[PDB]
Design a protein around this ligand. Structure first.
Ligand SMILES: [Zn+2]
Ligand SMILES: [Zn+2]
Lengths: 375, 375
């Protein structure tokens, strides 16, 4: 019995909220916040602009449908994380703080809250040696020297393997030139970036009836689209050519990137301004080059259709399995049993590359172990 | 066999602006418009909200760049269309008014204008019998009775095989209940809808550096995303279930729809509100179902990666070749020659299904012929 018969399964897309972070979320009035209501036995976690028109309604009425999503024991409990892993035959998790990280924290307290949280994550991973690693979080509201010291901390921090971060960066996007030395620091520290959505799109794009459709529009369309816009702006700004040893893992198989790379390239090629400014040269690095050299994709796509396009774009050696625990728990079955949300992704892997093939082993664990040095 | 040795090639995504429509645009002072500028030989076509900052500058400073895009002969000339078709071995084009159609017209003249434009297309198609069919355009600002009159007219109109419409419908989107009687009327008349983007996303999402990126962001990401959002809204509101006879072709392979169908499905399944409201369950017609029964997809995706995803989601019998002429002319080479934007899609079909295979023949023309009754 050997490694191939009994492979190491790894989930690289799995979130927590440590107790301190909830303490902050509870003591808040604007997004993000956690607030207990009488009807639902669990505190309601409210994170999105779309959840707002339901919060302003459930504050002036105790009969109204509860806002946001349930804050369960799955967000905070580590034993809960381990239990989920054991039920789903996951061997190793790479845990990360969930959206919106520290992006709202005031510039002054940010650094210290960052240090505290990342220390906590490292302690958690310490509780189960071998099975836990983490993407740390950055205080991007803090000024440059705090940021750099934070990165230095992470690079020294046990069990750490990268950082997770959203698409606003320093408040101007990811193509913001002031971001560069931070990328450079990350790159030099060998800290892999897990880029992840949160802000989605302007709430108005969803139309008037949007509340009839639950969280579907913002979570299924808004998140992946946000990720695609972020990375495409990163790319058009030249961040990848400029910071060559930068390594990013995109949430939700790059959002819609694999599907649109063709279109992006064709649009570049055919852009009057871009060609006449000498930007469409023949030695240019394409979206495809970045997709094969600098960017990795998670396999959180829920179907072999998307998974197959993701694999086409990046290669099966650049895909990594995830679950997005615990944001999509079972409603009508036991939260302690099998999660449909996991089994869809496993099924997509199986249908895309075959059960037990070498590509399946790579996507289910090996790629992650190699790329994120999980020793 | 002779039919196989010499297949009919059909282009279903191709645009013109009739002389009369151009006139209407020429006397306008707000989007959309056409006016001449000293600095460029051809008048400028201004459609996008992204082109407004350049326009404001061009009026005030004669050394600034000419805003918008060249309104070339490719837009208004029929002979130029036939030339494009011959250069690229295209046997039949199903032509259509380009965005923004009649979305800007007053309710009281919309019907008269519509009738005039649709009649003109019919006349053009009549000029090269056998090689030209069109999607008509609808007076979507006019009152319901006028709409139905238009639909009745199109149903009878020589060379008409459907209608093209944008993603805003009557202003409030495609999940607007007032669209139902229009959808039903189109369905009953066998007018296939060609759903096409225009409004993209709020120009704010491209960020502060957007001007450095030419038209890439609004065209490469904005358009296909607008399409995805429109169809997703239409699907979640039950439109497809309510009008079972409805047939829609989606522009740009459904935007990003095939890559996201899985995600949408998992999100519906896991939505607290939708489950509580009893909308989840196993007799629900899925996105997948809709993609195989009601919705067709054009092949304007520029890459085999995406095209394979589209075929996976809809089947090779539901994909149709298109060029998007004349929106992406070569910049570097002669515009009377070969267009890279045709070459790229041709190559996508070739690499996705194999040259000369039955699937290639179907996508490149047989599908259109069967679905749009071009014989
Ligand atoms: Zn997540
Ligand atoms: Zn078009």
């Amino acid at each position: 019995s050997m490694a191939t018969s009994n492979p190491t399964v790894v989930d690289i897309h799995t979130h927590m909220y440590p107790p301190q972070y909830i303490k902050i979320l509870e003591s808040r009035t604007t997004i993000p916040l956690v607030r207990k209501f009488p009807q639902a036995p669990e505190p309601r976690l409210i994170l999105l602009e779309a959840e707002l028109g339901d919060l302003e309604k459930a504050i002036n009425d105790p009969s109204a449908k509860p806002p946001g999503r349930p804050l369960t024991s799955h967000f905070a409990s580590l034993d809960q994380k381990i239990h989920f892993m054991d039920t789903h035959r996951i061997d190793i998790s790479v845990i990360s703080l969930a959206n919106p990280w520290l992006d709202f924290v005031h510039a002054s307290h940010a650094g210290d809250i960052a240090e505290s949280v990342n220390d906590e994550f490292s302690d958690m991973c310490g509780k189960h040696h071998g099975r836990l690693f983490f993407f740390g979080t950055l205080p991007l509201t803090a000024p440059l020297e705090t940021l750099l010291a934070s990165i230095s901390h992470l690079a020294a921090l046990k069990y750490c393997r990268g950082v997770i971060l959203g698409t606003s960066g320093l408040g101007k996007g990811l193509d913001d030139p002031h971001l560069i030395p931070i990328f450079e620091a990350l790159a030099a520290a060998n800290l892999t970036i897990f880029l992840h959505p949160h802000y989605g799109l302007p709430n108005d794009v969803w139309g008037p009836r949007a509340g009839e459709y639950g969280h579907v529009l913002p979570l299924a369309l808004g998140f992946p689209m946000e990720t695609t816009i972020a990375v495409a702006r990163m790319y058009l700004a030249g961040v990848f050519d400029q910071v060559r040893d930068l390594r990013m893992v995109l949430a939700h198989s790059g959002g819609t990137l694999p599907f649109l790379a063709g279109r992006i390239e064709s649009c570049i090629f055919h852009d009057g301004q871009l060609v006449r400014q000498g930007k469409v040269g023949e030695n240019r690095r394409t979206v495809w080059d970045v997709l094969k050299e600098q960017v990795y994709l998670d396999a959180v796509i829920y179907s072999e259709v998307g998974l197959k396009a993701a694999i086409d774009a990046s290669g099966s050696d650049r895909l990594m399995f995830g679950t997005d625990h615990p944001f999509f728990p079972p409603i009508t079955t036991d939260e302690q049993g099998q999660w449909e949300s996991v089994s869809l992704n496993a099924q997509a892997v199986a249908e895309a590359v075959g059960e037990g093939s070498a590509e399946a082993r790579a996507i289910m664990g090996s790629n992650a172990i190699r790329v994120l040095r999980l020793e």
